[PDB]
Symmetry: C2
Subunit: 385 residues, 2 copies
């Protein structure tokens, strides 16, 4: 049941902004590791004396990497005379964010029909303001409200990347592509799920998205057409193995974005490409499930995936779960940086054709149980041996 | 003339430590871009609750990348009970360094016979102390004194990487190698050369190394066998084109390390490998000199390099200079990070065989003149056209 109760018109995920210490090195590492091309920049070479911002793209996926210059470079400036291309940026906030959380997501940006109205309605409905609506070059409006922790939800709307950004010279823009195409969902970790859900659903009108002992409780908020999907987790205390949600909050110094799920148009090719680069500057993946997990795949997805595709899932370490409507293939990277906080999910969904409906196949909640049972069977198999 | 006046026994460059915001992403980028393998780590997985440190190696070259965790993780600790593997590390200092300078070199480390005596003698001779001698696991002694700006000169001595570091698992250690073999020299930029030279030569006993209108004055300090080479630059003001040394001081917020020169055993192969990766996560190089520069190469190094090697220098953008004792091949990267501050030089020296004597061929000072004349001739050639 989707009551379609959005309080403003939301279109789709627009971009994700990382706040970095050095945006150059993070962006180059992500570009090689994820197969995203350098598409736009705003830095000293474009007249920005305030921050360095580099944009990577793959299909519709946009990752923005931003870091501050020395404040001394823009000492003469005031907000009305700023050279920053993102006027919500603030040296002090950026340094405090990164000092407090390390590398991670500052902004989850969604495209809306009218960012000014989205901001007004949001705050009228309980959102905590972060940056007021600002119109850039009479062409794009940006506004920001607090989402959770130090993460903001950013509204962007276009009259017809951003003004002040320059498209990147083809020589520096190598056309990497490993198959990633868009942001599927963006997941937050919070100390208390209930108040976080009430707050965000409160000011967006986003509804609970229906789903279907291991560290978390979660719920998913969704836009009208369910193409903007915002899951939120809380830890469950008093277990035997410590909650990874609690571990996150400790190392992140509080709530923040936990993982970004990136849709691939061919998850086999994405994972082959990413795995070739894991030890030469790219991203590492979580340890693969045991062969028992994959033997168990025939009995639950044998009608969707052939035996060859199931064994290709096994070679690549890919997980599979299924809804009543569709099938999901997924895998998780190790943490993106020094701290055991943010990671990335690669995902591809099968089914729910009408275009594919958002969230088709769920989010893989069933894989917590299947991973447990598969690890237990595998140990018993070898113990027997 | 080398008066061999070192005040303690200095062996060779040991390592260079970068202070980072996220050590994971900088280290992976450098590894791919320079062809250095992951060799050792000290982080949460080794019991270090204070900092993440990752060591890359190529031949004898050691790059250490370090970033702080949340101070909350080590709140219970005191220096006598620390889990840090580098006891001079300090959260506040590291955050201030990076906030002030961005990505750059915190420590130039040299191996000495006795780090405690090197520290005592240094301070007795004017060095400003930074971290007192500390003996690690009864096996290695580390001490630090101020060099210039927020850069320290670090002494390391071994009884027989560092205690508390673990060697890295072969799977995560891909044996990259593009030919780089050791640190040749490490160059500082300061506002006033005279007092910097007096200070450092004062407490080391290092002597001036003999050399042979464009932005700088420089001088080179050297150890007894001239294998530790520490050039220092100051800007020259009142020129037409602004001094790149002054630009550095402005964007770096004061003095600091300007470039690291990395010796290659085959600079042609290094530059081919590095240039293939420039647009896929590696390092970019300065714009190549015009063809006139390379036509002029025959008249000054035609006796050292064949016409094929000279045209291979041209394909790769390599510079050539020569002393009265040896020949030098060199090239410069664009800045390593967001700010126009630190960069890297790749170098290979021809001559002075006895082993090769340090500094053989100089540092390429003659290339400032040759680059000017070559750019002038090339423009006149095309202007004529
Ligand atoms: C992150 C994750 C998801 C996931 O992505 C979501 C779960 N709920 N929602 C809304 C989601 O987006 C699904 C199954 C998983 N199974 N095992 N693991 C281990 C490596 C610890 C997971 O991390 C894991
Ligand atoms: C850095 C550099 C050196 C160098 O490495 C040293 C010069 N003196 N000492 C002690 C050194 O180590 C030599 C010649 C150069 N010619 N042109 N350029 C332009 C790209 C701006 C240089 O940057 C350049
Ligand atoms: Co997910
Ligand atoms: Co040099």
């Amino acid at each position: 049941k989707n009551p379609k109760s959005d309080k403003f018109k939301v279109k789709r995920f627009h971009h994700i902004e990382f706040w970095c210490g050095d945006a150059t090195n993070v962006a180059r590492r992500f570009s090689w590791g994820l197969g995203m091309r350098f598409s736009a920049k705003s830095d000293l070479s474009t007249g920005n004396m305030v921050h360095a911002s580099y944009l990577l793209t793959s299909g519709d996926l946009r990752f923005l990497f931003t870091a501050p210059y020395s404040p001394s470079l823009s000492a003469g400036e005031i907000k009305p005379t700023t050279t920053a291309s993102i006027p919500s940026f603030d040296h002090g906030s950026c340094r405090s964010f990164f000092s407090s959380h390390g590398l991670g997501v500052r902004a989850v940006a969604i495209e809306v029909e009218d960012a000014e109205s989205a901001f007004s309605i949001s705050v009228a409905n309980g959102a905590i303001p972060s940056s007021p609506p600002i119109v850039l070059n009479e062409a794009v409006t940006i506004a920001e409200v607090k989402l959770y922790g130090d993460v903001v939800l950013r509204y962007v709307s276009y009259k017809a990347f951003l003004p002040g950004f320059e498209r990147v010279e083809d020589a520096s823009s190598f056309p990497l592509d490993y198959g990633i195409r868009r942001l599927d969902h963006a997941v937050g970790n919070v100390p208390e799920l209930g108040p976080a859900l009430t707050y965000v659903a409160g000011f967006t009108g986003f509804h609970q998205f229906a789903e279907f002992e291991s560290g978390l409780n979660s719920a998913v908020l969704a836009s009208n057409d369910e193409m903007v999907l915002l899951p939120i987790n809380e830890p469950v205390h008093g277990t035997k193995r410590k909650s990874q949600i609690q571990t996150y909050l400790e190392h992140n110094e509080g709530a923040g974005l936990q993982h970004l799920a990136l849709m691939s148009e061919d998850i086999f090719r994405t994972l082959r490409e990413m795995r070739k680069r894991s030890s030469i500057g790219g991203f590492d993946f979580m340890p693969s499930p045991p062969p028992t997990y994959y033997q168990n795949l025939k009995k639950r997805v044998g009608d969707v995936l052939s035996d060859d595709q199931i064994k290709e899932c096994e070679e690549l370490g890919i997980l599979v779960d299924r809804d009543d409507q569709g099938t999901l293939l997924q895998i998780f990277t190790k943490p993106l940086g020094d701290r055991p906080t943010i990671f990335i999910e690669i995902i591809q969904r099968v089914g729910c054709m009408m275009y594919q409906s958002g969230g088709c196949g769920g989010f893989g909640k069933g894989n917590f149980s299947e991973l447990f049972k598969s690890i237990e069977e595998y140990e018993k198999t070898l113990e027997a041996k």
